[PDB]
Amino acid sequence: TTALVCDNGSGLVKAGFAGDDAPRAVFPSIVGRPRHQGVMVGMGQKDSYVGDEAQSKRGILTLKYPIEHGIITNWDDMEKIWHHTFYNELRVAPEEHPTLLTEAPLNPKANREKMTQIMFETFNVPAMYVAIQAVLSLYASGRTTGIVLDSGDGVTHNVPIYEGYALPHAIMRLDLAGRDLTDYLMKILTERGYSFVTTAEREIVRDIKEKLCYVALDFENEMATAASSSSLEKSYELPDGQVITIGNERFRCPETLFQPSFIGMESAGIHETTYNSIMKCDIDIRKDLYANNVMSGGTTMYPGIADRMQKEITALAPSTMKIKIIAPPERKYSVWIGGSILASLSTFQQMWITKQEYDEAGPSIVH
Template structure:
């Protein structure tokens, strides 16, 4: 089989979920929690649940949280437990996708500010632990832009653990102008959980937190004018909605629906530890202003939202409005939010892996053997 006919395995590993599938497809084949669980008493819990290895990954671990010691391998977009990460990849390759790793090139996403050492570790694992024939590590900002058919734009990649704001020009991320905000979807979930607790809802367990995340995804939206809407809420209950819990109870939401996403524009709402954290709209403006003046207008006109934490309805309108207020007079500002933006990085990887030029980007096993893992920096 010729190289350009090989199907590439595409892995997008985030703080919350892993998306996995094959190049050329329009959706990942598998999506699972980035979670690993170990039996508290080796040799007992695993066998009891039909898993003699005592290691549970993804949904297997999430559904048994109360019985296991669990680990989240990725924190704020960075791998913090490589052994657990290897368990996740093993599960994805062999259980979710059911592939022979030695027969497929692999493309793995990385955070835009990933360290050189961690990039090398990714390549080392793909070759040493999984015997992949070739490997590519690609940053999520550029891939997210590819998923929209663009090669230039300002990417706002906001996932569970962090938000990156990065200018991409003609297919290349401009790392010196990349900005990171340590605010993500998990912070929004925790904020909503705290608000609901104050309202009398007893959300305390890990399973409860997962339900709060579902409430957030179901009912929250970005307000175009938070203060005006707060005033309106005092006069009317027309925006009140409810969420049905598995036990039949209902959770009622009024102003929480929009005050939670408001934390993207006012991070201090998340608590004292977030005081001084930059707001999303000011970070976008500052990142663009650092770029060469000749490309700034195009970046203002192509602000691309990506990642699960950008799914709040009307967020694109709010971003566009706030950035327009900061941009130079006469500048056209446009923020775009495609329906499948939760999977933007994976979809970009699917597109990239389908290109005839893709083999020029990969590291081969022979190159790895000859030069070591550092060869990846010449191809990234």
């Protein structure tokens, strides 16, 4: 038997057996109950559709993401994600695979207890471990030192690791992006008359967030050049047929990551949380936090980064210091490519939670 690396995405849950390429299965985590009367009565209709079927039945359901602010909203829907995934996606037996699960560095307890407990008693996995997503993005990177910027929809993190230790008093969590970037994009699409009201229509917003957004090099000059009559304007096509023309707002929405006041978030931007996390680390270690600034996750893949991120950090940081922004190929699968390396090496198999230990100590005192 082989171990299974399953990343508890907040998107965009990722699943695949131990190594070597990229996750076997990726899906948007949606469950949706039917919001219009069934009186056609074929019948044959499912009580709750999961993805991908919840993306081929839009407008007849009400899509509900089961993870909200990085917290499992109800484990009733979450367990159904898991069951659906193991049985009708991956097609593997629970009692036959040691698993690897992920979490967020700054998150409430007993959220990991209740998780660990429900998966051991419901699915009876033969072994389990729960890793923070940032440490796996360090393993994925393959650098041995650096400050990790792990940004997925929608919990970001700033974790500093230096060969091979970490500082407790340094992690910063912003709930800045990205589901709020979806809502903000929906609020500034009203500026060109596009009103997307329903849950289903929110997916269309997400599709323009995927394909057509970019980030500016300099805010003031992109705002200036938007005022020019020259066509920044991009023509999107709608699944119903319609042609949607977006301009200014196309670079405005991601720019929020360099200015949270515009989305109504008081705290300082990714720009400043990077600097302020570096200046919570000791004198010697700062030298190598500069030039081991490592980004990760799907929401760091916008076209205007990393050279925006580069120019902005390089301006605020102390003069004459070597600053390079490490941005891997295919950051969306970074965490998973991390997890594969971890569970395949010796000896951290003997840092896995196992059934004998669970029988003795249950959800209590896991470390």
